[PDB]
Amino acid sequence: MKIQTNAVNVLQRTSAYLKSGLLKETPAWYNVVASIPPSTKFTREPRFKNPSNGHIIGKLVDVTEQPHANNKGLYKTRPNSSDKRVGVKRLYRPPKLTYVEDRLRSLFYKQHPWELSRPKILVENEIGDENYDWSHMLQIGRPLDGESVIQRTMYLIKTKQYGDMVEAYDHARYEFYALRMQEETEQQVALEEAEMFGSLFGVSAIEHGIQKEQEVLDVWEKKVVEETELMAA
Amino acid sequence: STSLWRSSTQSYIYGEYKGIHIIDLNQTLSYLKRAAKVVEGVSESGGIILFLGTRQGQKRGLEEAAKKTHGYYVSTRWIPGTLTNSTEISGIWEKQEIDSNDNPTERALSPNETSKQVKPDLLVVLNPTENRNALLEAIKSRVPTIAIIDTDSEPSLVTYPIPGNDDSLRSVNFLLGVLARAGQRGLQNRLARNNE
Amino acid sequence: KEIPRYENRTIYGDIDFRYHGVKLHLRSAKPGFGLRVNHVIFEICECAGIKDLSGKVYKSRNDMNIAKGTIEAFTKAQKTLDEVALGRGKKLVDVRKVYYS
Amino acid sequence: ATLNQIKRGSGPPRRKKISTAPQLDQCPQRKGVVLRVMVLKPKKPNSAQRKACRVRLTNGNVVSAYIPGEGHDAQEHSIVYVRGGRCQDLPGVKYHVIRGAGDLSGVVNRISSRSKYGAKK
Amino acid sequence: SLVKLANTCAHLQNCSKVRVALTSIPYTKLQLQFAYNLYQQGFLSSLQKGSTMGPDKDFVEVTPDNISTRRLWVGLKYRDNKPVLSSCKLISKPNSRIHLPMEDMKKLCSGVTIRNIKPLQPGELILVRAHNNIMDINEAISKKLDGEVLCRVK
Amino acid sequence: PVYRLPPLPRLKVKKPIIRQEANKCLVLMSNLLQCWSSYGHMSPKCAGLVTELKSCTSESALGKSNINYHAARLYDRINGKPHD
RNA sequence: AUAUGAAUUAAUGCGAAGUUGAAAUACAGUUACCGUAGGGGAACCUGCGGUGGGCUUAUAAAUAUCUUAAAUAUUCUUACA
RNA sequence: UAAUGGUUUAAAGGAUCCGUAGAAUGAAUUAUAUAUAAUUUAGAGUUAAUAAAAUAUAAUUAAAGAAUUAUAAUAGUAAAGAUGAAAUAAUAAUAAUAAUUAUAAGACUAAUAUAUGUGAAAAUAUUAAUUAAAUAUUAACUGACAUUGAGGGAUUAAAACUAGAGUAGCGAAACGGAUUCGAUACCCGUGUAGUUCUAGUAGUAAACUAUGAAUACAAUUAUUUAUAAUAUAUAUAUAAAUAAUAAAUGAAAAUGAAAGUAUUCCACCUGAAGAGUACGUUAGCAAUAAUGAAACUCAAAACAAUAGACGGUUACAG
RNA sequence: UAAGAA
Ligand SMILES: [Mg+2]
Ligand SMILES: [Mg+2]
Ligand SMILES: [Mg+2]
Ligand SMILES: [Mg+2]
Ligand SMILES: [Mg+2]
Ligand SMILES: [Mg+2]
Ligand SMILES: [Mg+2]
Ligand SMILES: [Mg+2]
Ligand SMILES: [Mg+2]
Ligand SMILES: [Mg+2]
Ligand SMILES: [Mg+2]
Ligand SMILES: [Mg+2]
Ligand SMILES: [Mg+2]
Ligand SMILES: [Mg+2]
Ligand SMILES: [Mg+2]
Ligand SMILES: [Mg+2]
Ligand SMILES: [Mg+2]
Ligand SMILES: [Mg+2]
Ligand SMILES: [Mg+2]
Ligand SMILES: [Mg+2]
Ligand SMILES: [Mg+2]
Ligand SMILES: [Mg+2]
Ligand SMILES: [Mg+2]
Ligand SMILES: [Mg+2]
Ligand SMILES: [Mg+2]
Ligand SMILES: [Mg+2]
Ligand SMILES: [Mg+2]
């Protein structure tokens, strides 16, 4: 769509109306818009750095800055055909944001597919209210999930307590297991202790599933019988 | 989604992540403060403010913004021609004289006064992509407008864009509540000086 | 609309504007120079307050299209001296305005 | 269209005004002898009995000339003077005879436009 | 090279139509002089040396090793929803080079059509080449210097 | 492979096919006639069918798709047309 | 070489009122047209290839899911925190 | 008194490419008066290496396959074939048609398949081989050697012609049967030329993308397509093509990386009709091809779109 | 110092 002119210049056209006398009374917005001008450039703006990983956008390494033989043993003595092509488009293409955590988020849930069955709430409470010390995994205001493992891993890396991401990730994994075993034992023992004092529950999870299966299976029986009778004819 | 990008919104974008474009929230904050100040200034001047949003669950926020700014809202449907054909559409509905304190005077209006166009001083649209008619009418009727500009929306169609997500009711209600509070503060200042 | 005018009598520079099939060539003129243009353009200039103007119409000479396209020529294909000066950050001086003080 | 093509002879066609009376040889008029007087039918939608005559000019060309005016006295072997100007509804007749010149008398009892019909005051 | 200057003029028009803030042009003495004249005349916001990938942050010295990958990066100006550099055209074309003396240059600056060249406009810049120096037409008139009338920019 | 279409004047199925549920009466009648063909006429081996037939045909002897609406409603949203 | 007459002779234009075919324009009732060949007084007919300036005019073989449903969400008017 | 033009559709892109002249145009830095000189590698090239089916294209040579027609048999019997329905001087009792075998000959190339692709265009898709060409990226090298291209050259569908072979199917012409008021047509039957091959001539097509070539540039999306990675996943980057578009252009239809922004070179156009005609010339065995007028007549003539009317126009309902 | 019309 053509860059529109008549939405951002309402003040100028209104002032022409007022000066000519076509409009008698000044509108209520007139002085407000006069004191707060709209942005009227509507330009494409280049970018020179990827915000996420800090990679510089728009630098060409020269042959002088590659004085050493490449992996195939050949020196670089002249520019290649990629260096000679103007790369202005990269300056305007919105950069792809990248985080190592995402590679480490994919791994965790490949190693623990049943951690995907733990429901997650994506509704944020307030990102500014978070004050976490990742020296430990449990945090007040957070659940225990894969992100706890990964944030602890990143903490361990940035403090150089481990040099390799693999070892930090494994350490975080074992702390996560330590906490999960405690939680599951807490749940089981809480239920056991509740039953030992006369807690009378109604439908459990197993009975819930049984009743839903029954609801589905009744309709399935009816359809099967109807289809068999129809097929016979 | 990056597949639905309107490239004229390039300068508002921070990057792409998970197959969608991320809006640069520093720019969103700057534009939002500018638009909020425009709303506050218009409410402080006693002008008419209209809140337009025609998506499903936006009625509550629009009504509350209107009621705390002493403004007006539409959420059902924007009748095309509501501004450029105001006589044929809005001419029949009733009008009212009010004092500096927004107190009904209960004066009897002439039929000629009742028949006049009463044009908004400010239009804020929460879903400008589905409200092109309103934007074009505001341009023709020369009404400054504010809108939430998503990655697929044309920025130049509004006077005061706010880059942001127009698809989430939480984001829309956050921005709308900010503008409504700015209008409320302008109204409170107007009443304060009119009580002094 | 509002039409930019140099000295409230002519157009700022020259205009070579195409509106559909109509090629307009307008040229600003000196004081006392008349409206030496197509008759449609003459009527528009009479209404707009343009007093001095030269010009020629090529290709289509449809009256409606001439009329409509001359107004886009006046509004879109003109830049005032102030706009140019502020855009370039330079001072544009009118030599005749300064010769007579 | 290119500069070298314009140099080689490309350009706007000349607005060359062709002669509509080639048989006069760029003369205001020529003397002639009427070979016959004809009565022709105009093209449609016009309907009339148009008075014309074939005339051989002094330069040898034989042309068809319309005889204007209400009544004429042209007859075979009459000396006439022929100027340009076609009769629009008679195809092939591209010349007019001059009333009041030669053996063709001016229109009888003409009041208006007498000079166009060879009539005295 | 007038062909490359024409390419640059057309490229500047193209970049102004889409409103890109920064673009690149070929790295040559004529291109650099032209860009500098535009920059000093207020048509460009910035002029930098750089590579095919972007403007140089720090000085990078140009040698035959990197000459083929050098570019000149120019920042375009926009104001009040209008480009500052709208039109940019050659006067002296590659197939018809127009060299004028100082008197005809004064006539052109005074409103006279010389050799079918439309005269200078109120907010227009006509550049002239003299002794392999690009310069403003009025400056050439002041220095009493005949030259090749090169391009208009408005 | 994905075959995207050009901008269409419409998105409509010419003759949408619907769920024609078979009449129970006709199925019962077919089963009863098969029974009489195999086990003889007025056989006692499927009197139940006869009873059921009598019970189902007693009062009455015989006992639309919305795809176009939703296609028209959603075509502009899903067609992936580039922005104006 | 060039002009001027020429018996005879080829083509073509126009006009008045008509006259005859049904070739084209719709699937124009045998798709039209380009090239080429034969036939025919001619309009046209037929053969061979090409083009769309005709078929993009394109539009389903159909079935869908489980957590605290409310003393709890739905209320909320710068409040609390 | 309009070229401050045009050429997809209104008049107008050359069939295509190669390339000579160009008094056409054309890179970079420095020095000295647009040139000279020395330097440079961004255009344009050369040679290798690596990857890929460079499979497709051209010529040549050698093969395969389904079917058709005719001939001979075998058994079997009265109709067969064609059409809207029929009828045909040459279907069948001289045993036909149909079936099953066996021989012979030509021409063609089912599926894959999209002409995707390859080729300058024309063309080109059953198989194999020989020869020739065509891809990308790296390495090294030359140092503007380039672009375009009047004239010229080469190739160039189908038809046509000259010789010599071949001729199963199809089939101009011709002869018959129908249909019809009439049939000179559509339909049916025999069927010559041609369609096939070899050596030529000829150089035209709606030879079309109705769109000349090259260069620089301009906002997106989606698909493939081909490489290069990185560990099926990066909804992976870099190219080309295709599809839908922004902007721009445009009489609009629409084009869309060109019908945009620019530059260079060439071809062509200047109302309709007369007319791609006449005359002349050149070439050709001819048919013809190329070049290509004027008089006469008129105020027309055309393109896109709009709304109807109409259609031996579609679909849906009632 | 460049005007169009039927
Ligand atoms: Mg949105
Ligand atoms: Mg008179
Ligand atoms: Mg017919
Ligand atoms: Mg027909
Ligand atoms: Mg015949
Ligand atoms: Mg072809
Ligand atoms: Mg048709
Ligand atoms: Mg069509
Ligand atoms: Mg002129
Ligand atoms: Mg035509
Ligand atoms: Mg044409
Ligand atoms: Mg071509
Ligand atoms: Mg042609
Ligand atoms: Mg095949
Ligand atoms: Mg060439
Ligand atoms: Mg063929
Ligand atoms: Mg042949
Ligand atoms: Mg032969
Ligand atoms: Mg044969
Ligand atoms: Mg046959
Ligand atoms: Mg017929
Ligand atoms: Mg026949
Ligand atoms: Mg040949
Ligand atoms: Mg021919
Ligand atoms: Mg031809
Ligand atoms: Mg055009
Ligand atoms: Mg000929």
Q: How many Cβ atoms are within 10 Å of B164's Cβ, its own excluded? A: 24
H-only helix segments in chain B: 25-44, 59-69, 86-89, 111-115, 132-141, 169-194
Length of chain B: 196
Which of B123, B117, B114 lies closest to B78, judged by CA?
Answer: B123
Q: Does C25 map to a domain?
A: yes
Query: Is C70 among the domain residues?
Result: yes
Q: How many domains does chain C have?
A: 1
Q: Is residue C2 part of a domain?
A: no
Chain F interface, best mutation among B1, B2, B4, by max F CB count within 10 A:
B4
F8-to-A163, B161, F1, F79, F81 alpha-carbon distances in Å: 59, 33, 20, 9, 10
What per-residue string of b and e applies to A24-49 under the rule 16 or more CB within 10 Å gives b?
A: eeebbbbebbeebebbbbbbbebbee
DSSP E144: T
How far apart are alpha carbons C93 and E116 in whole angstroms?
Answer: 26
Q: Measuring CA to CA, which residue among B132, B130, B135, B133 is closest to residue B146?
A: B135
C1 vs A contacts (CB less than 8 Å): 13, 16
Backbone angles phi, psi at F59, to 5 degrees: -90, -45
A208 within 8 A of F1, measured Cβ to Cβ: no
Q: How many residues does chain D have?
A: 121
The residues with which D96 forms a beta bridge, in sequence order, are: D66, D83
Query: What distance in Å separates the CA atoms of residue C42 and residue C54, rounded to the nearest whole number?
Result: 10
Compute the count of residue pairs across chains A and B with CB atoms less than 8 Å apart: 100
Going through E32-132 in order, the beta strands assigned E by DSSP cover 44-51, 70-76, 78-79, 82-83, 88-90, 99-100, 125-130
**Phi, psi values for residue B162, rounded to 5°:** -125, 105
- How many Å lie between the alpha carbon of B22 and the closest alpha carbon of chain A? 9
SS3 A81: coil
Distance separating alpha carbons of residues A55 and D24, to the nearest angstrom: 91
According to DSSP, the residues that pair with C94 across neighbouring strands are none
Cα separation, F74 vs F66, in Å, equals: 12
**Pick from D17, D85, D27: nearest CA to D61:** D27
What is the DSSP secondary structure assignment for residue C90, as one 8-state letter?
-
**Is C59 in CB contact (< 8 Å) with chain E?**
no
- Between helix A146-158 and helix A100-111 the angle, nearest 10°, is 130
CB atoms under 10 Å from CB of F73, counted, come to 11
Helices (H), C22-94: 39-48, 63-76, 81-88
How many whole angstroms separate alpha carbon B126 and alpha carbon B150? 10
Resolution to 1 decimal, in Å?
2.6
Tokens, residue D115:
């000079």
Give the Cα separation of C98 and C100 in Å (integer): 5
Chain B residues within an 8 Å CB radius of A4: 139, 154, 156-157
Other beta carbons within 10 angstroms of residue D24's beta carbon come to 20
Q: Do C81 and E122 touch (CB under 8 A)?
A: yes
Q: 3-state class of A35 per DSSP?
A: helix
Q: What is the DSSP secondary structure assignment for residue E124, as one 8-state letter?
A: -
Both structure tokens of B81: 């021609």
**Amino acid letter, B155:** P
Which one, of A63, A58, A59, lies nearest residue E68 by Cα?
A63
> Which tokens is D79 given?
């000396």
C7 Cβ under 8 Å from any chain E Cβ: no
The domain that holds C45 is classified in CATH as 3.30.230.10
Closest CA to B131 of B83, B65, B186, B183: B83
Cα–Cα distance measured from residue A2 to residue A42, given in angstroms and rounded to the nearest whole number:
11
DSSP assignment, residue D101? B
Residues A215 and A209 sit within 8 Å (Cβ to Cβ) = no
Contact between D55 and D62 under an 8 Å Cβ cutoff? The reply is yes
Q: Which two tokens stand for residue F34?
A: 């098969």
Instruction: Look at residues A59, A62, A57 and name the one whose alpha carbon lies nearest to residue A76.
Output: A62
**C30, part of any domain:** yes
Q: β-strand B72-74 against B49-52: which pairing, if any? A: parallel
* Structural domain contains residue C1: no
Contact B117, B170 (CB under 8 A): no
Q: Cα-flanking dihedrals φ and ψ of residue D79, to 5°?
A: -90, 125
DSSP string, D13-43: PP-----S-GGG-S-SEEEEEEEEEEEEPPP
Is the CB of C37 within 7 Å of strand I?
yes
List of residues 6+ apart from E134 with CB closer than 8 A: E30, E33, E34, E36, E37, E127, E128, E150
Question: Helix, strand, coil % (nearest 5) of chain F?
Answer: 50, 0, 50
What's the rounded Cα separation, in Å, for the pair B183 and B185?
5
Half-sphere exposure of B63 (CA within 13 A, CB side): 6
Give CA–CA dist A100/A106, Å, rounded: 10
CA B30 – CA B17 distance, rounded (Å): 23
Q: Which one of F20, F23, F24 makes the best mutation probe of the A interface by having the most chain A beta carbons within 10 Å?
A: F24
| Residue D45, preceding peptide bond in cis (omega within 30° of 0) | yes
- Its domain, for residue C77, covers 14-99
Phi, psi of C15 (to 5 degrees): -130, 130
Q: Which of E65, A3, E114, C56 is nearest to B10 (CA)?
A: A3
What experimental approach yielded this model? cryo-EM
B contact residues 141-170, partner A, Cβ 8 Å cutoff:
142-145, 154-161, 170
The tokens describing D17, both together, are 């005004």
- Residues of chain F neighbouring B4 (CB-CB closer than 8 A): 83
Token pair for E135: 């310069």
- Cβ atoms of A32 and B35 closer than 8 Å: no
Q: Give the closest residue to B142 by CA, choosing from A37, C2, A10.
A: A10
| DSSP β-bridge partners for residue A71 | none
Paired with E78 in beta bridges are E83
Tokens 């006295």: give the residue: D73
Residues near C96 by Cβ (< 8 Å), separated by ≥ 6?
Answer: none
Residues B161/B166/B170/B175 CA torsion (nearest 10 deg): 10
